Amino acid sequence: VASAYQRFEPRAYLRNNYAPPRGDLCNPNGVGPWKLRCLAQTFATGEVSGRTLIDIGSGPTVYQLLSACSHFEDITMTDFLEVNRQELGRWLQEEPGAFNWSMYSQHACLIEGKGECWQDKERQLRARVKRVLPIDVHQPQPLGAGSPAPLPADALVSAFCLEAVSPDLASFQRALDHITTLLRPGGHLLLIGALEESWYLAGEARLTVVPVSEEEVREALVRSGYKVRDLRTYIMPAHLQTGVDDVKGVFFAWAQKV
Ligand SMILES: Nc1ncnc2c1ncn2[C@@H]1O[C@H](CSCC[C@H](N)C(=O)O)[C@@H](O)[C@H]1O
Ligand SMILES: O=S(=O)(Nc1ccc(Cl)cc1)c1ccc2c(c1)CN[C@@H](CO)C2
Secondary structure, X not given: OOOHHXXXXXXXXXXXXXXXXXXXXXXXXXXXXXXXXXXXXXXXXXXXXXXXEEEEOOOOOOHHHOOHHHOOOEEEEEOOOHHHHHHHHHHHOOXXXXXXXXXXXXXXXXXXXXXXXXXXXXXXXXXXXEEEEOOOOOOOOOOOOOOOOOOOEEEEEEEOOHHHHOOOHHHHHHHHHHHHOOEEEEEEEEEEEEEOOOEEEEOOEEEEOOOEOHXXXXXXXXXXXXXXXXXXXEEOOHHHOXXXXXXXXXXXXXXXXX
């Protein structure tokens, strides 16, 4: 896969998945509103807290941390590709060419209902993201030997990574076992991913993906030593079925390392 990922174009990836129609946040039935709503509700339970958090395979996106950032003062973002870490850098440092996530920040504020202005939410994320490190979930030690990242983390977040870098279920299970080592016992894992997908595009790159089911993800979490606190499925409607992939749904898993 690492080979195919050498052609991965962040801008194309962003455009394919986070720009209209999939990125439209006005229609309450879209995947965008559904996902932000499920990230906000999880953190609103007050049960997912601590000091440090690590986002596994962040790619060029930050939406997965909008609701999470107000609960963890030290946040580590990561990704296998340097081009993605650079794309993140552009938004974090507010440099030219950064992707504009303002509609997402605003919706997270809208959903959270704490009366927070979106600039303050983005300010807080930028402030708490202490570093952006390389990572490889295929390695028993994903971050490596002496990573600047505070370990073990009190919580992990990973969206669309594992199944997208695993050729099969068994390999999926190992990557999960792998990243699980980065988590403090009793800690929390918020895993988001593509259901029954076999490929997706990112510019000249065409990636192979392992198609997994909700049941398969649940059992994998259980086998890695987690207690599944919540599991949800969003079925991808026809209007969101574009030619960028063959994903059937999106899953969300809130797991607790026991
Ligand atoms: N071996 C590996 N270990 C960890 N991440 C990897 C990887 N190989 C590829 N990746 C990264 O996994 C990501 C899958 S796309 C998901 C991006 C983002 N988390 C989102 O929610 O959209 C890409 O950023 C890709 O570079
Ligand atoms: O759900 S999405 O259609 N877009 C989306 C997700 C979250 C929000 Cl907040 C908004 C839009 C979405 C986002 C990323 C990926 C997909 C779908 C499916 N392919 C994966 C890579 O395998 C990558």
